[PDB]
Design a protein around this nucleic acid. Structure first.
Lengths: 134, 94, 136, 135, 38
RNA sequence: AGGAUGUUGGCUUAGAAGCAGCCAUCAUUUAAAGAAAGCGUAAUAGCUCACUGGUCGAGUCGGCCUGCGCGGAAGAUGUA
């Protein structure tokens, strides 16, 4: 049982994926194009986390989850890299609205009972990575 | 509100005051107003616990001596040079 | 190493170290290191204890040094007989009486001040204790 | 730990919830990971059911206020209460399939009607339809 | 075994024991923490 | 018995997932669960702590003031 964060319609590479679950008994090509097959619908260049699930006979299933908060916050701030020193160096702005969107996606993935709570968690991430909410 | 029980001192001086502090007591004095000053004894550890609170030096305390309450305020305190002890307290009549 | 910039005389009598100390309460900071013993404090011991406390709190807050080594101590060199005048000044000391507050600290939590003072007390030749600022 | 002012406040709140609700289901929940709980919480919020783990001492104080004083004896061992504040049942239902499915913990006694409900026969509540079934 | 004049607990698992008039430190986790006053 | 979710927090790095280092240390679901106290891995995994529900059933905790002891304490002719 292994967890990865793989690029949408991309899979197979050796330093990225290969070795990682390859050294657990997992059929590479199968997961590659099954993963891509279902992640076709994702927007281009959204890094998506997948939980791979292998059984004693080397066969496997997997679940796809919503992209990381840090990722969505990177894209929402229009940036590429979080701050090297979060809350000492600020690197941008997401409106309360963007927070809410990300929150609803990640709401499909949160544990918040309300929009506000989820949004607060996403804000927590946004703070953690030196993005200001503006 | 702090209430203190005290006894009038029978004799003063260095020799008498050191015997008090050996007997787990310590002398004090009450002056102020037109009355004459009054030399008293106090139980040390009991007073030592009360003075550990900041309001002890700000509020008005009552000292019952011969069954008579006297309202005073802590004026000055002589502490031991290096021990957590009291050596003398000045009480001024409120 | 603390030392008077200049003095009226170079050498002093040995003297004695009787009596209790003056300055027996924390007057600048909130916590203090009060000496309960009697003895001398050389300038090196004062500096050693200061560095131990300065590094203990990672150079934070404020630290006062309430003593100053103003007494010169002379020594005769080796293989020298008695007489032929007083020896040369070698180091400076501060006479310490019981109750003297040596260091004061402010701007740090009490639990941190105790460890800082504990590290510094290990460098001093006299027994000390921890004291805190009180309402006079 | 919990100052006395805390625990008084914990009681008050559990009691206030007890007044509004209509069907209380009590169960052991020991030996279940937090993920399966977190899952049961989304199933409680979804189904309008209030969920709390609370000290058995502290529950006895809430209960006595009325009309759950039968439940006292259900407060021996690890206790999880389920307050279906909006609609009745559904918790009683929910807990059992969740109970069966996970073969950890047990379920103790429920309570409706100011009447204690025996572990086995709870199947009564756990088959009562929707409100919203009389039409 | 550390034979020193000042024995102290070095971690959470160190225990102070007095055996035959000798203060000792035994540690169920770190064998380096074994001390005895001497 | 639990010790969860965003999440492998951001940066860095071949990797850095609580646990080389730097910065941040919020928020959620919570009975409670640190953006992690220590071990562990190449990085994960895995062990354990903080914390909390349960059991038990009346005391238990850690500072001060002091009395008397313990260690620290190895020499040469022979106890000495």
């Amino acid at each position: 049982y292994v967890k990865l964060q793989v690029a949408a319609g991309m899979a197979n590479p050796s330093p990225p994926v290969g070795p990682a679950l390859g050294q657990q008994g997992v059929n590479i090509m199968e997961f590659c194009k099954a993963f891509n097959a279902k992640t076709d619908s994702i927007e281009k260049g959204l890094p998506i986390p997948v939980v791979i699930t292998v059984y004693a006979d080397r066969s496997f299933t997997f679940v796809t989850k919503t992209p990381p908060a840090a990722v969505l916050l990177k894209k929402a701030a229009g940036i590429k890299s979080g701050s090297g020193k979060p809350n000492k160096d600020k690197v941008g702005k997401i409106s309360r609205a963007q927070l809410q969107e990300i929150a609803q996606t990640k709401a499909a993935d949160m544990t918040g009972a309300d929009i506000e709570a989820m949004t607060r968690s996403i804000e927590g991430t946004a703070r953690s990575m030196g993005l200001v909410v503006e | 509100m702090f209430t203190i029980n005290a006894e009038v001192r029978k004799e003063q001086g260095k020799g008498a005051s050191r015997r008090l502090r050996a007997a787990n007591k310590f002398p004090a004095i009450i002056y102020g107003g037109k009355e004459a000053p009054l030399a008293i004894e106090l139980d040390h550890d009991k007073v030592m616990n009360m003075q550990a609170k900041a309001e002890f030096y700000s509020e008005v305390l009552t000292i019952v001596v011969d069954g008579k309450e006297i309202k005073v305020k802590a004026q000055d305190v002589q502490r031991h040079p290096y021990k957590p002890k009291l050596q003398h307290i000045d009480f001024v009549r409120a | 190493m603390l030392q008077p910039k200049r003095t009226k005389f170079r050498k002093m009598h040995k003297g004695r170290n009787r009596g209790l100390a003056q300055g027996t309460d924390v007057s600048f900071g909130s916590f203090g290191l009060k000496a309960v013993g009697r003895g001398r404090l050389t300038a090196r011991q004062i500096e050693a204890a200061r560095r131990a406390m300065t590094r203990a709190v990672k150079r934070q807050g404020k630290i006062w040094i309430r003593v100053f080594p103003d007494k010169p101590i002379t020594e005769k060199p080796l293989a020298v007989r008695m007489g032929k005048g007083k020896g040369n000044v070698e180091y400076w000391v501060a006479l310490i009486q019981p109750g003297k507050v040596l260091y004061e600290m402010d701007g740090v939590p009490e639990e941190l001040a105790r460890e800082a003072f504990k590290l510094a007390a290990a460098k001093l030749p006299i027994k000390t204790t921890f004291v805190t600022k009180t309402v006079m | 730990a919990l100052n006395l002012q805390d625990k008084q406040a914990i009681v008050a709140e559990v009691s206030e919830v007890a007044k509004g609700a209509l069907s209380a289901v009590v169960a052991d929940s020991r030996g279940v990971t937090v993920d399966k709980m977190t899952e049961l919480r989304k199933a409680g919020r979804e189904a309008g059911v209030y969920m709390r783990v609370v000290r058995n001492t502290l529950l006895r104080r809430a209960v006595e206020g009325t009309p759950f004083e039968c439940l006292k004896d259900a407060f021996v061992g690890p206790t999880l209460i389920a307050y279906v504040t909006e609609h009745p049942g559904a918790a009683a239902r929910l807990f059992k399939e969740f109970a069966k499915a996970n073969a950890k913990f047990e379920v103790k006694a429920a309570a409706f009607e100011g009447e204690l409900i025996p572990a086995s026969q709870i199947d009564r509540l756990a088959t009562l339809p929707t409100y919203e079934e009389a039409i | 075994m550390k034979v020193r004049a000042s024995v102290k607990k070095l971690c959470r698992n160190c225990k102070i024991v007095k055996r035959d008039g000798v203060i000792r430190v035994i540690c169920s986790a770190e064998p380096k923490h074994k001390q005895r006053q001497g």
